[PDB]
Design a protein around this ligand. Structure first.
Ligand SMILES: O=c1[nH]c(=O)c2ncn([C@@H]3O[C@H](COP(=O)(O)OP(=O)(O)OP(=O)(O)O)[C@@H](O)[C@H]3O)c2[nH]1
Ligand SMILES: O=c1[nH]c(=O)c2ncn([C@@H]3O[C@H](COP(=O)(O)OP(=O)(O)O)[C@@H](O)[C@H]3O)c2[nH]1
Ligand SMILES: O=c1[nH]c(=O)c2ncn([C@@H]3O[C@H](COP(=O)(O)OP(=O)(O)O)[C@@H](O)[C@H]3O)c2[nH]1
Lengths: 313, 302
């Protein structure tokens, strides 16, 4: 039962300790009837100064701050994420890759600017109830936690989201779609490049999901980017992952020498199966990302929606 | 849900702090042995909440535990499970500074800065005496030592196992240590602490018979020869008497010796059926002669 918080760097140990600690405190806090305005301006702050004690993995001195814990707990709940699962995913073993995932690939942890933390506070009330009015059915990021760590007198802000991609299905190709953008010769020459818009268009890539899931994708995309427009938010992207079922079947068999294309929508919430009659059997993951940025937000809404409308069939 | 609801905020912080430190310790491996730094170590946490979890706890406070590895090991050597200790402090607020936990199992005394200094001065030798006597001792059994900061004022606390039983009511109490006696004021409280000379003027005796008298004296001698060899004085032996018959006015005179470690049955040849509780207390403020005189006084009570 013993959690050592062993990690390759001390800040990950503090992250694990911090999520463990804050979730445990939260378990002794009743779940409220409703959120109250103060919950949107609240925070928890702990400062640890140990001496000759418990130094094998944690630093002796550090600080941990969690922003709006009542709100983000309610968000976890509205996204179907149990608190015990959340803490287990972060603390059973050190996150990996700044950008991290939990070891089980379920949650993504991005470090962010002080400005991003400002913008989250500014949008949080309206974001919380956009989530509530759409019952968690959205392609926007699903924010589960926001934290400030202090190790060596240095502050680091982190935002936790649900992974856009599946936690079990491999992603074989990825795009960040939003002028003109493309992938660097450096980026294009790496294990899994992030192809931008114009490499999607030069490839002639198409995603065949058939009518019903095309329609529910476009309906939630319109609702989502009208929300971000009405919040004067820009520079966001749609992140797109392609899972080639057949290639996965091969790669598994190749490690076996030394279901298939099936997934749980309650967990892989951005995932879509390819249409019955489509050249290859594929799974797609598509979500809106990078929404904490702030030329026109209405224009951004319309242009972004037209492009993403056209990547489907 | 542990709300830490308490009669004053400092008790809430005490409950929170013991809960937190015990949970952290469950993530610290039990070492093959204690090391010298464990006797100089401490845990310190500082809480600054804002608009959050303020219904029972204060928003800002500090909690420091002294030598947590050492006191965890002492808990183990006294047969006290960590989660039981935590439950006794946190399941419900301590009561009546001098406190017990809601279940009356552990005593929480507020102490001086100097007492914390002195405990540090004796701690290694005290731990070694605990290991050499296998927890079989009439000394105080220290389970934790903490410093709380609430409203910028520090409060030091030491947790001991209760001398008295946690279920059997104590009907008369004596503090045996010149000449000392109980005040007219104390003599009018509900349960006076009758001091040495009122025990003698009362003619009270504790009949435990030969078998149980002998190694009570053996352990008393071992203990205060230890405290002499540590130059400790001004300590007392505290003694409680439980009369079964008044209790009658699901069993009487019944107790678990594994829990009420200082308890003794009255001898068959004793006028009334009684339960006695007896241990050494107040051993923290810093000659040899005291050892012999104190041991002699306690010697003549069987
Ligand atoms: O609009 C907001 N409503 C809020 O309710 C709120 N709460 C925090 N913040 C943000 O926090 C950022 C830096 O971090 P932070 O201020 O959390 O550190 P701090 O003030 O506790 O300590 P320190 O930096 O002096 O050591 C600040 O620039 C603010 O953007 C908020 N912004
Ligand atoms: O939920 C997610 N699951 C992922 O698996 C994932 N991978 C990347 N991203 C995002 O895409 C951009 C980085 O792209 P990148 O080119 O790899 O790195 P950077 O753009 O900073 O140079 C940033 O928005 C990243 O946070 C992901 N989001
Ligand atoms: O383990 C214990 N269980 C007890 O139930 C208990 N009751 C009293 N004591 C001690 O006896 C002296 C106070 O006696 P007191 O006369 O009531 O108060 P004070 O002497 O401060 O005026 C101090 O050493 C007290 O901590 C107890 N120790």
């Amino acid at each position: 039962k013993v959690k050592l918080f062993r990690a390759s760097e001390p800040i990950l140990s503090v992250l694990m300790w911090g999520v463990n600690h804050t979730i445990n405190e939260l378990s002794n806090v009743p779940v409220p009837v409703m959120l109250m305005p103060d919950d949107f301006k609240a925070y928890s702050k702990i400062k640890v100064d140990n001496h000759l004690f418990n130094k094998e993995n944690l630093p002796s001195r550090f600080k941990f701050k969690e922003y709006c814990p009542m709100v983000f707990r309610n968000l976890r709940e509205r996204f179907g994420i149990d608190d015990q699962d959340y803490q287990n995913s972060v603390t059973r073993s050190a996150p990996i890759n700044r950008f991290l995932t939990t070891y089980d690939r379920r949650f993504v942890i991005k470090t962010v600017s002080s400005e991003d933390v400002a913008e989250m506070h500014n949008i949080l009330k309206k974001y919380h109830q956009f989530i509530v009015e759409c019952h968690g059915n959205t392609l926007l990021p699903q924010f589960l936690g926001m934290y400030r760590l202090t190790v060596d007198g240095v502050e680091t802000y982190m935002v936790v989201t649900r992974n856009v991609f599946s936690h079990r299905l491999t992603v074989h190709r990825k795009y960040d779609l939003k002028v003109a953008r493309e992938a660097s010769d450096k980026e294009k020459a790496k294990d899994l490049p992030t192809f931008k818009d114009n490499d999607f268009l030069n490839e002639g890539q198409k995603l065949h999901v058939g009518e019903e899931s095309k329609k529910n994708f476009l309906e939630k995309l319109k609702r989502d980017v009208e929300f971000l427009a009405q919040l004067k938010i820009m520079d966001y992207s749609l992140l797109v992952g392609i899972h080639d079922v057949d290639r996965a079947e091969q790669e598994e068999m190749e490690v076996e020498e030394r279901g298939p294309g099936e997934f749980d929508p309650s967990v892989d919430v951005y995932a879509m199966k390819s249409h019955e009659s489509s050249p290859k059997k594929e799974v797609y993951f598509m979500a809106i990302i990078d929404i904490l940025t702030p030329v026109n937000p209405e224009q951004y809404s319309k242009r972004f929606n037209e492009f993403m409308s056209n990547i489907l069939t």
